Swiss-Prot record, chain D:
It comes from Homo sapiens. The modification N6-acetyllysine is found at K95, K97. The modification Phosphoserine is found at S10, S56, S57. Belongs to the peptidase T1A family. InterPro entries: Ntn_hydrolases_N, Proteasome_alpha, Proteasome_alpha-type, Proteasome_asu_N, Proteasome_sua/b, Proteasome_subunit_alpha6. SUPFAM superfamilies: N-terminal nucleophile aminohydrolases (Ntn hydrolases). This is Proteasome subunit alpha type-6. One of its GO terms (molecular function) is NF-kappaB binding. The gene is PSMA6. The 26S proteasome consists of a 20S proteasome core and two 19S regulatory subunits. The 20S proteasome core is a barrel-shaped complex made of 28 subunits that are arranged in four stacked rings. The two outer rings are each formed by seven alpha subunits, and the two inner rings are formed by seven beta subunits. The proteolytic activity is exerted by three beta-subunits PSMB5, PSMB6 and PSMB7. Interacts with ALKBH4. It is found in: Cytoplasm; Nucleus. One of its GO terms (biological process) is proteasome-mediated ubiquitin-dependent protein catabolic process. CDD domains: proteasome_alpha_type_6.
UniProtKB/Swiss-Prot annotation, chain E:
The gene is PSMC4. Component of the 26S proteasome, a multiprotein complex involved in the ATP-dependent degradation of ubiquitinated proteins. This complex plays a key role in the maintenance of protein homeostasis by removing misfolded or damaged proteins, which could impair cellular functions, and by removing proteins whose functions are no longer required. Therefore, the proteasome participates in numerous cellular processes, including cell cycle progression, apoptosis, or DNA damage repair. It is found in: Cytoplasm; Nucleus. Component of the 19S proteasome regulatory particle complex. The 26S proteasome consists of a 20S core particle (CP) and two 19S regulatory subunits (RP). The regulatory particle is made of a lid composed of 9 subunits, a base containing 6 ATPases including PSMC4 and few additional components. Interacts with NR1I3. Interacts with PAAF1. Interacts with TRIM5. Interacts with ZFAND1. The chain holds residues 350 to 418 of 418 of the full protein. It comes from the Eukaryota. This is 26S proteasome regulatory subunit 6B. Belongs to the AAA ATPase family. The modification N6-acetyllysine is found at K48, K52. It comes from Homo sapiens.
Curated annotation (Swiss-Prot), chain F:
Keywords: Acetylation, Cytoplasm, Host-virus interaction, Nucleus, Phosphoprotein, Proteasome. This is Proteasome subunit alpha type-3. It comes from Homo sapiens (Human). PANTHER family: PROTEASOME SUBUNIT ALPHA/BETA (PTHR11599). The keyword Signal does not apply. The 26S proteasome consists of a 20S proteasome core and two 19S regulatory subunits. The 20S proteasome core is a barrel-shaped complex made of 28 subunits that are arranged in four stacked rings. The two outer rings are each formed by seven alpha subunits, and the two inner rings are formed by seven beta subunits. The proteolytic activity is exerted by three beta-subunits PSMB5, PSMB6 and PSMB7. Interacts with AURKB. Interacts with CDKN1A. Interacts with MDM2 and RB1. Interacts with the C-terminus of TBXA2R isoform 2. Interacts with DNAJB2. (Microbial infection) Interacts with HIV-1 Tat protein.
From Swiss-Prot, chain G:
One of its GO terms (molecular function) is endopeptidase activity. It comes from Homo sapiens. Keywords: Acetylation, Cytoplasm, Host-virus interaction, Hydrolase, Nucleus, Phosphoprotein, Protease, Proteasome, Threonine protease, Zymogen. It is found in: Cytoplasm; Nucleus. Component of the 20S core proteasome complex involved in the proteolytic degradation of most intracellular proteins. This complex plays numerous essential roles within the cell by associating with different regulatory particles. Associated with two 19S regulatory particles, forms the 26S proteasome and thus participates in the ATP-dependent degradation of ubiquitinated proteins. GO terms for cellular component: cytoplasm; cytosol; extracellular exosome; mitochondrion; nucleoplasm; nucleus; proteasome complex; proteasome core complex. This is Proteasome subunit beta type-6. The 26S proteasome consists of a 20S proteasome core and two 19S regulatory subunits. The 20S proteasome core is a barrel-shaped complex made of 28 subunits that are arranged in four stacked rings. The two outer rings are each formed by seven alpha subunits, and the two inner rings are formed by seven beta subunits. The proteolytic activity is exerted by three beta-subunits PSMB5, PSMB6 and PSMB7. The modification Phosphothreonine is found at T35. It catalyses: Cleavage of peptide bonds with very broad specificity. The active site is at T1 (nucleophile). Belongs to the peptidase T1B family.
């Protein structure tokens, strides 16, 4: 088409981006909490039946050995965005033989979202991303928005009850947390809105520390759930 | 691995027939892979909980704590809480309970766990009240209240305020037990108050 | 250059020498000629150093992306196909004599990829200037289903033969032993020639070349 | 403003044209069921030939993406054939490029990404067909996956597509609650009886197509009329 | 409490489901379970009866496209 | 969901412009194709709109290849475009692989082209449905039908156009699988004449062809004598039915 | 390089030496010149190893896709046609001769020789490679109509042995492959199973 489908409304707002935000807010809950020694990205991975093999489509995906990424919104849009983020990280490594800094990766994913907001025949991505990373010797948690705007967060939540999750994180969160404690906080925040018994499979969590980002296995998530019950 | 499983079903059969042999085999397994050891610790702790023996299981805590935390699962708070709750549902007033709880709390402090530490401190004030150490119960409860007020959960808060109310009812008459009970009721009015907590309040 | 590889019972062992000669002079003494393609795949490089480096880096990045997509451990067949197809695309102008070797789910594999894109899946390969001597050693004392230590010694002997009997070959020997479980990267495995052990200190006094100008700049920390 | 093309986000999300693609998939009129056992994966599908003039050998919703991967298509038949050709091309390209057979999960990921591009761009429509892929993975066993026109590609233990998708899913749900360790005959019988119960029809060997992949024989085989009749007769006797 | 259930019912499995159903819906579920028991000529309601009644009554399952989440 | 583009789904999940293309298809006169045991026979009820045209002035039977012949129904411009597309597909197949394109493969390729045009809104669906027919010694006699939506289905006897249902009943009243082409030609002429609506169209010509073993797997127009004999058979059948 | 493919009633048999020289040095001593294409079609490669491998992979991809599309086993003539199109289009880029040979249900037992240049011609028996000439006259003398399976195997072994023994650029082991209804059966003549003369 070549004509942008995201245009300013008579009130100076991009209604297309607002509707993408609504689609995101209608997505599955997800929480990201950065501790003193790492970050945790937890998310609701509830299926609609036990037929769904909850081991093939992963809600939390790694993009580099020190960067992981979870989302809230459209699964297919998340897939394309994670693929693009992986490609951007590989290009950065190839140019500079050094793992891409988390800030740069979120910047480039945000640029991709912005150019899909601006381009002609396309639609804004209906996902909000929650990149986590351990570049340098510091943990980074970034939220990237369908508008292409990225915010650094100490801890945040996005999904169905994201306002309630953010209030809960404000009450429960402190700068002195430690990774195994931030995991507890993240699972507790997810439980704050979870509708039903929280099994070790219908939830997914991924940590990111000095060793590198890794998606906790259902066994470890089960142990955390048992400690949190 | 295969030998571990074989001896696990051997312990199950001896649980069915004569529990003592199974319990001894579980101790043998523990003395003797990390999954096998932790699992066997779990079953033998449950068995001691069922049989009512307390000194042996306290010695088990003392023994495991170092190896428990070192071998694997820095989230070993799982096992620590499990064994403490086995004690404390097998309440026996053996005296060693307070020392075990304090040791577990110090281990949690070293591990930097905070909610585990706070839950253990709450049930520790419960133990102090049950063992009549009212002054220590009051001090620890006040510290725990000051922590849980800033870290807002309101549930352990209501529990701790109820324990403080009972302690004041036992010791300092009822110009302070009434105030603590009022604080507990007000804090509980802002949360669901699961049936156990609501019945304790009432 | 002298790179080689041999598949033993439980896996593979790769071995490269250490030297880079820009022309006919020893430019480097500790050049790393074994490149990380994947956790279970390593590739020895020979020929144009930059060309081999960038080829292996590009394929390693492609395989990292592929592994991230799949969720499975990459395969030496995939690595070899990528290398051969790209080297064929660039009409032998991407000069990179490669000895690729890995251990995927389907056992250990060892390929020898040539600059023009031709590949050979052989139990033992040798490439580079000292390839002739290394293959002499392999044909001389290679037998199927070797053990870890004897395969290590065989590759060390082959690379040492290349180093000694070939000009422009390495100083030290680097090895990489890949198995289903371990990925040892012995760098250096040995140092057949260390240095000439310079005699006593012969430095001049403190201050022997004065200056025309001085521009000390106390930059801020 | 515009629920006429995908790229509008009616003002709560709700990609209406993608929902309409799902409605088209249902409107196709047929039903297909897929199950996986301990070592086998099976896909049955209703076969309707309401003419007696149709060859009845070209009326097939079972396709062979590659020698080791099969699929059953539901919904618009033209879109089904187009997506099947795309899947075959992607599988062949993967084999040529990487040197080993494409996994079923990766194939469904490719087709799901293509469908996602259709939903992302406004020029296209999300073609209204549901693909169910079957294969034997070297480590994960009998993989069974299902891709949909929105780009969703979750892998299933047992799924269904078509007009009776919900009832078939409920029946397979009930069956998989208990003793999901199914032999080849058990899983074939489960699929066939699921379809028969949901459609309230006693199946002749004619009006169903069955495709099977087993670990021992990891080659997508379309069972013949005789084999389908043998399975149906055994089902009736039991 | 007014009915006579078999000891194998375990209403907890039915309670712990993600369905927005009213008290009238719960009464309908129990009533249909009793109706199935009468149909099979039994005066004790079984887990089979409750399963069938719940699946017959709470049939709201439709749509909820998976790509929105 | 409007019906102004093929890229738009109806609220019912039904692309309406493809259905309008099909509506345009079922306005052409008629075209039957019967797959005998040793060949395929096409017949078209070519309506001479005016007597000014020459016989064969609007050929709806095209030779897509040596062994493949198509009968079209609908927009003649779109039908000719699809015939050219199929011709170039067959030529490309022969040049690339070196042997005559199988009819099933050619039908699949052309149907996928039709689907390519029914997908997007930058173009419109073809307004013609066609039947392909071929005979080969090693593959038998094959007849396929492709519609504006791009749905290629094999048939033993198929009919497109206005009176497709009437032609379908007339064809069902045959033992096609066991007849010979030399007789299926007469049967096709009879079916054309029966389904033709004299009071509605009046002027009428019958355009026949077959591809079979008697033609060595080659598509040809029916010889004049055979066509005249089949036409006489149809006339006498109509007379007998009237009597 | 030395490659032969000889036809018999009901199938074909292919054979090749296992040498690959980059000059006067044997880069590969046990090369596998025979390359399966789909299931029964095989190609014997000669000339530029890189070009031969690339064209073999491309034709394998094309023929696999074609067979999947047609839902039928590909024809040996079709595989030879693909090879010939590729070679004839890229004559100047490629330096690769090939011998396609195999079995298909329609006209089973086929041998086509696509030399460098890209001309496809069927033959009863086809010869190729650097060592082709040294045995091409011998095979012309010793070939006769009506060869059976094992007699074709012996003929191929003898011809390849002579070519290998008289050709510097050919040597190693003799890899043979018989294709027919049942399928493909491979074998290797290593050191003594290779026939010897004088």
């Amino acid at each position: 088409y070549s004509f942008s489908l995201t245009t300013f409304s008579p009130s100076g707002k991009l209604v297309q981006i607002e509707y993408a935000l609504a689609a995101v807010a209608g997505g599955a809950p997800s929480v990201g909490i950065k501790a003193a020694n790492g970050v945790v990205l937890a998310t609701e991975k509830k299926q609609k039946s036990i037929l769904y093999d909850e081991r093939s489509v992963h809600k939390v995906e790694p993009i580099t050995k020190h960067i992981g990424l979870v989302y809230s919104g459209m699964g297919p849009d998340y897939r394309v965005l994670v693929h693009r983020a992986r490609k951007l990280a590989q290009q950065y490594y190839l140019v500079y033989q050094e793992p891409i800094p988390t800030a740069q990766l979120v910047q480039r994913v945000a640029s991709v979202m912005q150019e899909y907001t601006q381009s002609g025949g396309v639609r804004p991505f209906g996902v909000s991303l929650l990149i986590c990373g351990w570049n340098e010797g510091r943990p980074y948690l970034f939220q990237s928005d369908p508008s292409g705007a990225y915010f650094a967060w100490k801890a945040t939540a996005m999904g169905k009850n994201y306002v309630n999750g953010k209030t809960f994180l404000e009450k429960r969160y402190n700068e002195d947390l430690e990774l195994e404690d931030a995991i507890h906080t993240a699972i507790l925040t997810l439980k704050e809105s979870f509708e039903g018994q929280m099994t070790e499979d219908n939830i997914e969590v991924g940590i990111c520390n000095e060793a590198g980002f890794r998606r906790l296995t259902p066994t470890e998530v089960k142990d955390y759930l048992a400690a949190i019950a | 691995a295969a030998a571990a499983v074989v001896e696990f079903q051997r312990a199950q059969s001896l649980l069915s027939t004569d529990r003592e042999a199974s319990i001894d085999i579980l101790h043998s397994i523990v003395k003797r892979a990390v999954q096998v050891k932790e699992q066997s610790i779990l079953e033998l702790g449950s068995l001691l909980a069922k049989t009512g023996q307390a000194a042996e299981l306290g010695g088990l805590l003392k023994y495991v704590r170092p190896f428990l935390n070192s071998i694997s699962k820095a989230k070993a708070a799982r096992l620590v809480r499990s064994l403490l709750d086995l004690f404390l549902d097998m309440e026996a007033a053996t005296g060693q309970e307070v020392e075990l709880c304090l040791e577990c709390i110090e281990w949690a402090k070293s591990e930097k766990r905070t909610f585990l530490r706070q839950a253990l401190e709450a049930r520790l004030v419960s133990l102090y009240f049950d063992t009549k150490r009212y002054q220590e119960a009051l001090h620890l409860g006040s510290q725990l209240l000051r922590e849980l007020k800033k870290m807002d959960d309101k549930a352990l808060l209501v529990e701790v305020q109820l324990l403080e109310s009972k302690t004041y009812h036992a010791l300092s008459n009822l110009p302070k037990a009434r105030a603590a009970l009022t604080s507990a009721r007000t804090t509980a009015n802002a949360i669901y108050c699961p049936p156990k907590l609501q019945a304790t309040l009432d | 250059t002298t790179i080689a590889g041999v598949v033993y019972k439980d896996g593979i062992v790769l071995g490269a020498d250490t030297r880079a000669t820009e022309g006919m002079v020893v430019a480097d003494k500790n050049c790393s000629k074994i490149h990380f393609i994947s956790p279970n795949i390593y590739c020895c490089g020979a020929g144009t150093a930059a060309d081999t480096d960038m080829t292996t880096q590009l394929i390693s990045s492609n395989l990292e992306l592929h592994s991230l997509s799949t969720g499975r451990l990459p395969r030496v067949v995939t690595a070899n196909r990528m290398l051969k197809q790209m080297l064929f695309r660039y009409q032998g102008y991407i000069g990179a004599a490669l000895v690729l070797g890995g251990v995927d789910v389907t056992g250990p594999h060892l390929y020898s990829i040539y600059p023009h894109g031709s590949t050979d899946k052989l139990p033992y390969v040798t490439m580079g200037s000292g390839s002739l001597a290394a293959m002499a050693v392999f044909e001389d004392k290679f037998r199927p289903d070797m053990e870890e230590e004897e395969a290590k010694n065989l590759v060390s002997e082959a690379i040492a033969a290349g180093i000694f009997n070939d000009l422009g070959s390495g100083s030290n020997i680097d090895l990489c032993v890949i198995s289903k479980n371990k990925l040892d990267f012995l760098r250096p495995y040995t140092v057949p020639n260390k240095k000439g052990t310079r005699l006593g200190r012969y430095r001049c006094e403190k201050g022997t070349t004065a200056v025309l100008t001085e521009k000390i700049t106390p930059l801020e920390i | 403003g515009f629920d006429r093309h995908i790229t509008i986000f009616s003002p709560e999300g709700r990609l209406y044209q993608v929902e309409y693609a799902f409605k088209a998939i249902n409107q196709g009129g047929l039903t297909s069921v897929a199950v996986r056992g301990k070592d086998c994966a099976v896909i049955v599908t209703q076969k309707k030939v309401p003419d007696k003039l149709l060859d009845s050998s070209t009326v097939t919703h079972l396709f062979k993406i590659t020698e080791n991967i099969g699929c059953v298509m539901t919904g618009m038949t033209a879109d089904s054939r187009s997506q099947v050709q795309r899947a075959r091309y992607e599988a062949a390209n993967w084999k040529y490029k990487y040197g080993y057979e494409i996994p079923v999960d990766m194939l469904c990921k490719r087709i799901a990404d293509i469908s996602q591009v259709y939903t992302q761009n406004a020029e296209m429509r999300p073609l209204g067909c549901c693909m169910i892929l079957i294969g034997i993975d070297e480590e994960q066993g009998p993989q069974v996956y299902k891709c949909d026109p929105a780009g969703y590609y979750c892998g299933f233990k047992a799924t269904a597509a078509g007009v009776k998708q919900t009832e078939s899913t409920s029946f397979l749900e009930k069956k998989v609650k208990k003793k999901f360790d199914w032999t080849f005959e058990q899983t074939v019988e489960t699929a066939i009886t699921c379809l028969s119960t949901v459609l309230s029809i006693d199946f002749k060997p004619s009006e169903i197509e069955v495709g099977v992949v087993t670990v021992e024989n990891p080659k997508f085989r379309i069972l013949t009329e005789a084999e389908i009749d043998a399975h149906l007769v055994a089902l009736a006797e039991r | 409490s007014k009915m006579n259930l078999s000891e194998e019912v375990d209403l907890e499995d039915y309670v712990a489901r993600p369905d927005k159903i009213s008290g009238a819906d719960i009464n309908s579920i129990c009533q249909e379970s009793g109706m199935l028991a009468v149909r099979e000529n039994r005066y004790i309601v079984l887990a089979k009866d409750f399963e069938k009644a719940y699946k017959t009554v709470i049939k709201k399952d439709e749509q909820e496209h998976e790509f929105y989440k | 969901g409007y019906d102004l583009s093929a890229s738009t789904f109806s609220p019912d999940g039904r692309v309406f412009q493809v259905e309008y293309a099909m509506k345009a298809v079922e306005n052409s006169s008629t075209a039957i194709g019967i797959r005998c045991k040793d060949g395929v026979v096409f017949g078209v009820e070519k309506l001479v709109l005016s007597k000014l045209y020459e016989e064969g002035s609007n050929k709806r039977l095209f030779n897509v290849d040596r062994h493949v012949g198509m009968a079209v129904a609908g927009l003649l411009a779109d039908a000719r475009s699809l015939a050219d597309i199929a011709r170039e597909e067959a030529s490309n197949f022969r040049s690339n692989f070196g042997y005559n394109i199988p009819l099933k493969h050619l039908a699949d390729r052309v149907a996928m082209y039709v689907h390519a045009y029914t997908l997007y809104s930058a173009v419109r669906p073809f307004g013609c449905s066609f039947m392909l027919g071929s005979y080969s010694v090693n593959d038998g006699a094959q007849l396929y039908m492709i519609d504006p939506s791009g749905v290629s289905y094999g048939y033993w006897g198929c009919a497109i156009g206005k009176a497709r249902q009437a032609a379908k009943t007339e064809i069902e009243k045959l033992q096609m699988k066991e007849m010979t082409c030399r007789d299926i030609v007469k049967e096709v002429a009879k079916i054309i004449y029966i389904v033709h609506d004299e009071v509605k169209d009046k002027a009428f010509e019958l355009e026949l062809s077959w591809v079979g073993e008697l033609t060595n797997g080659r598509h040809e127009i029916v010889p004049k004598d055979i066509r005249e004999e089949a036409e006489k058979y149809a006339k006498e059948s109509l007379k007998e039915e009237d009597e | 390089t030395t490659i032969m493919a000889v036809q018999f009633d009901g199938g074909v048999v292919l054979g090749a030496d296992s040498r690959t020289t980059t000059g006067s040095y044997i880069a590969n001593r046990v090369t596998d010149k025979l390359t399966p294409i789909h299931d029964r079609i095989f190609c014997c490669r000669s000339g530029s190893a890189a070009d031969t491998q690339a064209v073999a992979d491309a034709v394998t991809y094309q023929l696999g896709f074609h067979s999947i599309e047609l839902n039928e086993p590909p024809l040996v003539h079709t595989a030879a046609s693909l090879f010939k199109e590729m070679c004839y289009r890229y004559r100047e880029d490629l330096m690769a001769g090939i011998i396609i040979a195999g079995w298909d249900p329609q006209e089973g037992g086929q041998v086509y020789s696509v030399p460098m240049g890209g001309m496809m011609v069927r033959q009863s028996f086809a010869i190729g490679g650097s060592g082709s000439s040294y045995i091409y006259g011998y095979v012309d003398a010793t070939y006769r109509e009506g060869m059976t399976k094992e007699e074709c195997l012996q003929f191929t072994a003898n011809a390849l042995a002579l070519a290998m023994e008289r050709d510097g650029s050919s040597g190693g082991v003799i890899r043979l492959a018989a294709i027919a209804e049942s399928g493909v059966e491979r074998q290797v003549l290593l050191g003594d199973q290779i026939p010897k003369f004088a």
